[PDB]
Amino acid sequence: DRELAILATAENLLEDRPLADISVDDLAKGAGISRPTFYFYFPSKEAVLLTLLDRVVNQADMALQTLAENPADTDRENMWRTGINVFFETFGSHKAVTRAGQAARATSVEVAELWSTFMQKWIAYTAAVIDAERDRGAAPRTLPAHELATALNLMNERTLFASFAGEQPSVPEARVLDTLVHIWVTSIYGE
Amino acid sequence: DRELAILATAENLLEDRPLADISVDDLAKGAGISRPTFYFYFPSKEAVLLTLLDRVVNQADMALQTLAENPADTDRENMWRTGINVFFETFGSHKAVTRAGQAARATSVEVAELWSTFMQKWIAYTAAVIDAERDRGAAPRTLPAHELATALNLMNERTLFASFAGEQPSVPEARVLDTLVHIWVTSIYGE
Numbered sequence: 001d002r003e004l005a006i007l008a009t010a011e012n013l014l015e016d017r018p019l020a021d022i023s024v025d026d027l028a029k030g031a032g033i034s035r036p037t038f039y040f041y042f043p044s045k046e047a048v049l050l051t052l053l054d055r056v057v058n059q060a061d062m063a064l065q066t067l068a069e070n071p072a073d074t075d076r077e078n079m080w081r082t083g084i085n086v087f088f089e090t091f092g093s094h095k096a097v098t099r100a101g102q103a104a105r106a107t108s109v110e111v112a113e114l115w116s117t118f119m120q121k122w123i124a125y126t127a128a129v130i131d132a133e134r135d136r137g138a139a140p141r142t143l144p145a146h147e148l149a150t151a152l153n154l155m156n157e158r159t160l161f162a163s164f165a166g167e168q169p170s171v172p173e174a175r176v177l178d179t180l181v182h183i184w185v186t187s188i189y190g191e
Numbered sequence: 192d193r194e195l196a197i198l199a200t201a202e203n204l205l206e207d208r209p210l211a212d213i214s215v216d217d218l219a220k221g222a223g224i225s226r227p228t229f230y231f232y233f234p235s236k237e238a239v240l241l242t243l244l245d246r247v248v249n250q251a252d253m254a255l256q257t258l259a260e261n262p263a264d265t266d267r268e269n270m271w272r273t274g275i276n277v278f279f280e281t282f283g284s285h286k287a288v289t290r291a292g293q294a295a296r297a298t299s300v301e302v303a304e305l306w307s308t309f310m311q312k313w314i315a316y317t318a319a320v321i322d323a324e325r326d327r328g329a330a331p332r333t334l335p336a337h338e339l340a341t342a343l344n345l346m347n348e349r350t351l352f353a354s355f356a357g358e359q360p361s362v363p364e365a366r367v368l369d370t371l372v373h374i375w376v377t378s379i380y381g382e
């Protein structure tokens with residue numbers, strides 16, 4: 001629709017500059033509509049970012065659900081690499097939305113709640129897998145699974161997004177998947 | 192001085208509310224000085240936060256330097272616990288400054304550079320220790336030490352500060368030290 005066109009313009013302009021430096025008129029111009037027509041589809045540029053971030057987080061969540069239902073037939077290290085990769089490729093395919101959506105957590109309760117909701121889901125799934133590994137005798141009973149899951153997910157959020165943003169310091173993007181897989185596997189399976 | 196009094200007032204008020212909700216007049220009132228007298232000691236409330244954060248980061252850095260020069264005579268797990276504890280206790284003793292200083296990274300190049308400088312120092316020290324452990328045969332040669340060091344430091348930044356801020360999700364503050372020690376030890380020593 002014109003909705004899709006607003007969303008594509010916003011994602012395009014966020015590659016060039018921050019949300020603060022993009023106007024409703026910039027989004028309207030880019031989508032080939034007037035400013036009042038824009039305000040019919042979105043109440044604000046902030047709502048546009050919230051919708052883009054919702055699409056990215058849901059894309060990651062659905063990719064992870066697909067993997068859960070379709071396990072790779074490979075060793076445990078490659079199965080964890082496949083799962084972390086869902087987040088590497090999904091957020092890594094949408095760096096501008098990832099960056100702007102992380103920044104908006106400070107100023108938008110809706111953005112903070114969206115992020116919070118999905119982190120709780122991803123941590124709960126990670127914890128359930130660690131517990132199932134322990135129950136089948138493949139992983140030792142060390143830390144409480146939900147606490148370990150929490151720290152590993154927060155590590156991935158900070159480390160992936162620092163790499164994508166080219167922060168100083170950061171792990172090079174071409175090394176971050178291997179880095180995170182090593183820490184997940186050693187901390188889940190290590191005595 | 193009146194400087195110290197401004198800094199104590201600012202740290203006090205940041206426990207109640209964000210920097211945006213604290214006025215120069217609030218800091219002046221709290222330190223028993225006029226607004227123009229305030230502007231003699233600091234150009235802005237933002238400079239006050241930058242100075243508070245500099246003091247906290249330097250306190251952590253000097254505590255770590257003290258430990259490096261005065262190793263605990265205990266096993267490797269307790270030596271890493273002692274070192275992570277420097278960051279747990281120092282930032283954990285200054286939660287309001289930690290929280291406001293992390294938020295200011297978005298809006299202050301000076302705050303971003305301060306944080307960046309010290310993270311590079313702490314990562315470099317972590318990497319040098321991992322290399323020395325590998326050289327003495329106590330740790331296996333797995334990931335590049337500087338990349339592993341980077342991810343472990345970014346994990347600690349995100350996980351400690353989420354715990355202190357009571358974010359949802361977060362590791363409980365009473366469990367975060369043990370959580371991080373487990374992940375550091377398994378990822379540094381694990382094959």
Ligand SMILES: CC(C)N1CCC2(CC1)CC(=O)c1cc(-c3ccc(C(=O)Nc4ccccc4)cc3)ccc1O2
Pocket residue numbers: 064067068071076079080082083084087088119122125126129133153154156157158160
């Ligand atoms: C042990 C063996 C039997 N199998 C292991 C692999 C499976 C099934 C079981 C499937 C998988 O793909 C997976 C992924 C994550 C998972 C969850 C979250 C992240 C993650 O990166 N967060 C993240 C990233 C950015 C921001 C916030 C969170 C990564 C992997 C957690 C468990 C999994 O189980």
Ligand SMILES: CC(C)N1CCC2(CC1)CC(=O)c1cc(-c3ccc(C(=O)Nc4ccccc4)cc3)ccc1O2
Pocket residue numbers: 255258259262267270271273274275278279310313316317320324344345347348349351
């Ligand atoms: C192996 C054995 C021989 N000894 C291990 C302990 C020692 C000496 C050697 C001393 C120590 O206390 C230490 C601490 C850190 C260290 C560095 C950074 C953090 C950290 O938490 N970041 C952090 C926190 C918040 C925000 C940003 C970074 C923790 C520990 C790194 C190496 C160390 O070596």
